[PDB]
């Protein structure tokens, strides 16, 4: 499925894994995908989140509260949670439906919003960003 990602979308999921590693987490969850969308910094997703006041620090602090730092450094490559896999599958479906041949950062964020139930979704709400508007603020930047 990675063959369909833009270079920057690829960067998002690489950074998501890096963030999971830094937190001593054993899975790449939707929350790590969220962190990766922010870390990527340049894409429509990063800009949408920045413009809705959703910060790397805000997300990190919520993840620390909800999940917490793990004790032991995990392996090099960390598997996705089932919910994160579902978000990536939905990201493809967003892009297809919108007539886009590639999956960009925008589509990963749209996919996350569409799944709408994982840790990332919970964090976004705790930080006062209703998921509906994230969709709005996104497709608008588009």
């Amino acid at each position: 499925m990675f063959e369909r990602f833009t270079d920057r979308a690829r960067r998002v999921v690489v950074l998501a894994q890096e963030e999971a590693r830094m937190l001593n987490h054993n899975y790449i969850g939707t929350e790590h995908i969220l962190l990766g969308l922010i870390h990527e910094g340049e894409g429509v997703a990063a800009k949408s989140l920045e413009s809705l006041g959703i910060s790397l620090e805000g997300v990190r602090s919520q993840v620390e509260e909800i999940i917490g730092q793990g004790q032991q450094a995990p392996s090099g490559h960390i598997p996705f949670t089932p919910r994160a896999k579902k978000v990536l599958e939905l990201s493809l479906r967003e892009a297809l439906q919108l007539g886009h041949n590639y999956i960009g950062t925008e589509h990963i964020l749209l996919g996350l919003i569409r799944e709408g139930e994982g840790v990332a979704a919970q964090v976004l709400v705790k930080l006062g960003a209703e998921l509906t508007r994230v969709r709005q603020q996104v497709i608008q930047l588009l």
Binding site: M1, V14, I28, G76, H77, I78, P79, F80
Partner: peptide, 16 residues
């Protein structure tokens, strides 16, 4: 990859 056993090239893990 999108599963569990060993390292994908970039991100995640895969099964045989």
């Amino acid at each position: 990859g999108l599963r569990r056993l060993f390292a994908d090239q970039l991100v995640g893990r895969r099964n045989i």
